[PDB]
Structure 1
């Protein structure tokens, strides 16, 4: 993921000026990477070395979503609606 894209997605999932690493931001970064990767997996059906990375990103996002759900269901719902998961 490009640095410009990460900065933009941090700002657009920001809760304040300095919130890099908030569960919302982490889920946003993972979702952006997975969305970019799904087309690559549509095309390159042999790139297993990216397949492992995709699996890892999916599991990471799942864990983050479960944690945010247990903590605050309201933030969880509004986040999952913002990303449409």
Structure 2
């Protein structure tokens, strides 16, 4: 749902290289942007369960990738969840 501009900006920020798009930081940052954006949608559409299912799929992928990135290295995990303010 993110525009191409926002997606490429997030990729270029959290990417080791601009070309790098599948790294765990890029993916978790895209997930975070979408999860933060859908808050305004579900603040009004409280009856939109069929989209909240996709929102839940996103928070689940984010939780799994955060677990992976934590076990893989503490450094990247700590700095990434500090930049995104996750797990405060």
TM-score (norm 1): 0.96
| TM superposition outliers: structure 1 runs of 4+ over 2 Å | none
Q: Which position in structure 2 is the counterpart of 1:34?
A: 35
For residues 3-58 of structure 1, the C-alpha deviation after alignment (integer angstroms, 9 at most, x for no partner) is 11100110111212321110000000000000000111111101111110010000
Assess, with a 3 A threshold, how the Cα gap between structure 1 residues 10 and 66 changes in structure 2: closer, same or farther.
Answer: same
How many residues are matched? Answer: 85
Structure 1 residue runs without a partner (length 5+): none
Query: Does residue 15 of the first structure (1) align with residue 19 of the second (2)?
Result: no
Structure 2 residue runs without a partner (length 5+): none
Tell me the C-alpha RMSD between the 2 structures: 0.8
Higher relative contact order (CA 8 A, sep 6+): 1
TM-score (norm 2): 0.93
Per mean C-alpha deviation after superposition, the further-off stretch among 56-65 and 39-48 is 39-48
